[PDB]
Symmetry: C2
C-alpha cells in the first residue's frame, strides 16, 4: 500500500526537455533521497528503470492518445497489460465516464482485478460524482488528478476556495483520497494533508524545472 | 553582458543522482523555455553541452577541491584555462580572502584579463569586506554565492533580517550585484530584485529535485 506522505510524479512526455526513462530514474532517486515515499511514473519503460533504482512503491500510468477519445490516462487493456508487465504496485487510470476507445471503465477495473489481483488501483477523477462512482467500483485510491483537465472542469484548480473541491471529495467517499494536480507549494501540501488526504502527488513543483522557472519569472510580471 | 532577470544554476556534482552534462543541458533548455535570461554551470563539459543547446549567456565555474585550501570555486589557472576553452561569457570564481592552492585571487584576475579579455568576471563572495575587495580588483559582477558557506560566516543566510546582508553589499559597491545562494522562493526573487540587484541566480529551488522534495517533507515535520 502507499504510505501517508509525499509521492513524487517523475514524468517528462515526448518533446519535454527531460524526456528519458534514464533521466526519470535519476529524478526518482533524487526524490527518494529527499524523503519521497512513492513515485508516480508514465510508461512501462520509465517504471522499469525507476524500479531498478529505488524500491519505492510506484503508481504506474500510460499516457497515450487514441483517435475518437479524450481519455489518455491508461485508456485501454493495452495500457493495462503494459502496466501489469511493469509490476508497478498501483495502476492509475482515468475514471471519468467519457467515451473510451475499447473497454469501459467497469470492464478495465474487472480486467485488473482478474489479471493482476495483487495490484491496487487508483482512480484519476475531475468531479465529486466521479469520485463517488470510483469508490463504489472498489478503487483503492481516488485522486484529484483530472480536476481542471477535462472540457467540463475548465478554469477549476484544486487550491481554489481553500481546497473546496478536495473537502467535497473527502466528505463524499470513505476510500483513500490522494491530492494530485496543482499541489504547487509546501504550504499547499501541508494544507491537503491537514484536510485528511491519505497522501499527495507532487509533479511540476519538483520535477518540471520549466514550470518552476515560470513561477519565478511570473512574480516579476505582476 | 548578463541581462536583468533570472539566471538558473544547472549544477549536479559527482555525488548527486542527476550528475550528467546531457541532463544539465536539458535543465538549461527547460530553464530557457520557462524564461531564464542566463545559465550558471559547472565544468567545461557541462558548459559546452549547454552552449550547443541554448544561446543564453553562461556563467562558468569549475568546482574542484584542492588539499591545503578551502577554495573550491575556480581555484587555480587550471580551472580558468578550462573555462576559457568553454567560451562561457562570464567566468565566476571564489573571491574570498582565503589562501588558494596556486595563484592568488589578484593574480588569477590579471590572468583572466590578459588571456580572455572579451570575458566578464564574477566574484563569489561571503562578506561585505570581500565585495569591496572584488570592486577594487575590477570584477564585472559581485555575487553573494558563498555567504554562510565559509568558516567565518557560519549561521548566516542571505534572506536573514529581510536581506540585510544583501542591502549592505548593495550599499558598499557600485558594481553589478547578483543575489546568489538561498534565493529559495519566487517571493525571495522578487524581494532581491526590488532591492536593486542586477540579476539573481537560483539553483536548488529549480534544478535540485532532492532539495525541493526536502522542503515539502520538512513542512510536515516542523
Ligand atoms: C492532467 C495531467 N496530469 C498528469 C501529470 O502530468 C501531472 O504532472 C501529475 C502531477 O500534477 P502536478 O500539478 O503536481 O504536476 O498529475 C498526471 O499524472 O495530465
Ligand atoms: C555555496 C555553493 N554554491 C554553489 C555555487 O555555484 C551552487 O551549488 C549553488 O547551487 C548556487 O550558487 C545557487 O545557490 P542555490 O542556493 O539557489 O542553490 O556551493
Ligand atoms: Cl520541465
Ligand atoms: Cl527572467
Ligand atoms: Cl565536450
Ligand atoms: Cl537533486
Amino acid at each position: 500500500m502507499l504510505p501517508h506522505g509525499l509521492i513524487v510524479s517523475c514524468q517528462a512526455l515526448p518533446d519535454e526537455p527531460l524526456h528519458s526513462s534514464f533521466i526519470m530514474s535519476k529524478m526518482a532517486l533524487a526524490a527518494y533521497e529527499g524523503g519521497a515515499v512513492g513515485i508516480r511514473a508514465n510508461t512501462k519503460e520509465d517504471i522499469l528503470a525507476i524500479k531498478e533504482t529505488v524500491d519505492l512503491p510506484v503508481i504506474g500510468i500510460v499516457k497515450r492518445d487514441y483517435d475518437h477519445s479524450d481519455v489518455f490516462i491508461t485508456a485501454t487493456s493495452k495500457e493495462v497489460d503494459e502496466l501489469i508487465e511493469s509490476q508497478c504496485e498501483v495502476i492509475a487510470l482515468d475514471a471519468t465516464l467519457q467515451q473510451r476507445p475499447k473497454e469501459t471503465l467497469d470492464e478495465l477495473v474487472s480486467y485488473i482485478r482478474t489479471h493482476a489481483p495483487n495490484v491496487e488501483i487508483m482512480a484519476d477523477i475531475a468531479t465529486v460524482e466521479e469520485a463517488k462512482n470510483a469508490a463504489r467500483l472498489g478503487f483503492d485510491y481516488i485522486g484529484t488528478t483530472l480536476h481542471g483537465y477535462t472540457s467540463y472542469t475548465q478554469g477549476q484548480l484544486l487550491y481554489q476556495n481553500d481546497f473546496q473541491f478536495l473537502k467535497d471529495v473527502l466528505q463524499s467517499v470513505d476510500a483513500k483520497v490522494i491530492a494530485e494536480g496543482n499541489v504547487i507549494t509546501p504550504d499547499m501540501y501541508k494544507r491537503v494533508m491537514d484536510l485528511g488526504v491519505h497522501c499527495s502527488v507532487v509533479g511540476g513543483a519538483i520535477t518540471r524545472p520549466k514550470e518552476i522557472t515560470k513561477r519565478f519569472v511570473q512574480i516579476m510580471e505582476d
